[PDB]
Amino acid sequence: LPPLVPALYRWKSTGSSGRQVQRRCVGAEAIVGLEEKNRRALYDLYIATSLRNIAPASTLLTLQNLKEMFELALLDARFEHPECACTVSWDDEVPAIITYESPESNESARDWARGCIHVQPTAKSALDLWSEMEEGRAAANNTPSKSIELFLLSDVSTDSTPIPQDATVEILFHSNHLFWDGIGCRKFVGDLFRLVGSYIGRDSREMKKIQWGQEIKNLSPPVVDSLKLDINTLGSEFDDKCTEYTSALVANYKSRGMKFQPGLALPRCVIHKLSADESIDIVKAVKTRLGPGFTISHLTQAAIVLALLDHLLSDDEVFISPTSVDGRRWLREDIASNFYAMCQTAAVVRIENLKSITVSHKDEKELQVRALESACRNIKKSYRQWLENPFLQALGLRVHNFEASYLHAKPIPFEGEANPLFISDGINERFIPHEIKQTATGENVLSVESIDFVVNQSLPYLAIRLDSWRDASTLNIIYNDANYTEAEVQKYLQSIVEFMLAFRL
């Protein structure tokens, strides 16, 4: 297994002015950056936010003036976090190249921001537009997505129609996954919602010009150089643990699992929003039944497994799932909480003795609870083997480099069957505010009602995401519609939800 490598991934000035820098991407970046996949938007991130106009009656909003305010916000945000204007290129190597260049002029910067914000008077939701964009893609037939763009939608006649009191404005954020992980992208949405507050109800042309060039130092530093651990100190324990992961990875590609139909078509999504009341009861049941260190994310992973067992093989089968985790805790404290580029690593969930946890929905509640509890303890114990290790972020970078190379070499890496994968997105309040306010007055202007986070799926496994907003948990399953019917995914999602609900006290 090739080593890191830190020098290989640092920012480099590409010319005399210092205004353009580039770096070879690393780890999970290399996976989502694979040229043949990135050009087809195969891992693109979308965040669908539904907002409600709760502003004072004297605040006049239109799609046209919202676009103007978000252009201003996006410029401020580019200064704070220039990942939003990085671009991608490739040579003959597997890892993508990430470039950042300061705007050549304030005019050029303004042109760029205008180019990233779009509006439509329409009744379509943000997710309706995702569907349309993916259908349109696809039909249009090979250019990588921008780091970020926004689409503002509202059911009004024109872009100068005042948005009625309590009317919905939807925003779809669309990002090339190369330049962010889910955390960084949501943090950036939060930043835009903060920054746009400066421009509601005002002389923006007269405001202090941004000194372009000065934001280069605001790019997230290279992950390798940001670690607590000195990677030069690594040895055979590190190599063995990396090999344990890559062995699990390769075996997961080849393992028995959920049947799928071969092919490739469009990414699709099925969403189940649990009520706040249900979510609070589920979280309480986890705390009570299982205690500290256990979470609804563990329970969801447990329910995924029980739903899989109920849906379906060898006596000694082990459920093995190479998952990804946020790597920020492995970064130095003064970097870790302000990191917008990809910062992901890897763990392997393992659950043995599947027969002992095989329960139907018609079995006694106590049997189901006991099965879920067993699985949760297996899940948490698994994570412990990975998360307690100080080299884990370094391992992620190294093994994900390998994974990118594997996926380049094997474009159809699953055959016949693929087990569902769980991704926890966590609590959205960490990153995005409940309201957009007029900053000068503190007045609420737009209520952020719902947040749905989607990542395009071009591989044949069910990718199951959990997050939370306003104390309500949402489960989303993203799948490719060549591989499953919507009905079977819905059936599976409902099964997972039913087991989660069964855990309630």
Swiss-Prot record:
Induction: Expression is positively regulated by the trichothecene cluster-specific transcription activator TRI10. It is an enzyme of class 2 (transferase). Its EC number is 2.3.2.-. Disruption phenotype: Leads to the accumulation of deacetylated calonectrins. Pfam families: Tri3. It comes from the Eukaryota. GO terms for molecular function: acetyltransferase activity. GO terms for biological process: mycotoxin biosynthetic process. Pathway: Sesquiterpene biosynthesis; trichothecene biosynthesis. Trichothecenes are sesquiterpenoid toxins that act by inhibiting protein biosynthesis. Belongs to the trichothecene O-acetyltransferase family. 15-O-acetyltransferase; part of the core gene cluster that mediates the biosynthesis of trichothecenes, a very large family of chemically related bicyclic sesquiterpene compounds acting as mycotoxins, including T2-toxin. The biosynthesis of trichothecenes begins with the cyclization of farnesyl diphosphate to trichodiene and is catalyzed by the trichodiene synthase TRI5. Trichodiene undergoes a series of oxygenations catalyzed by the cytochrome P450 monooxygenase TRI4. PANTHER family: CHROMOSOME 7, WHOLE GENOME SHOTGUN SEQUENCE-RELATED (PTHR42034), CONDENSATION DOMAIN-CONTAINING PROTEIN (PTHR42034:SF1). This is Trichothecene 15-O-acetyltransferase TRI3. It comes from Fusarium sporotrichioides. The gene is TRI3.
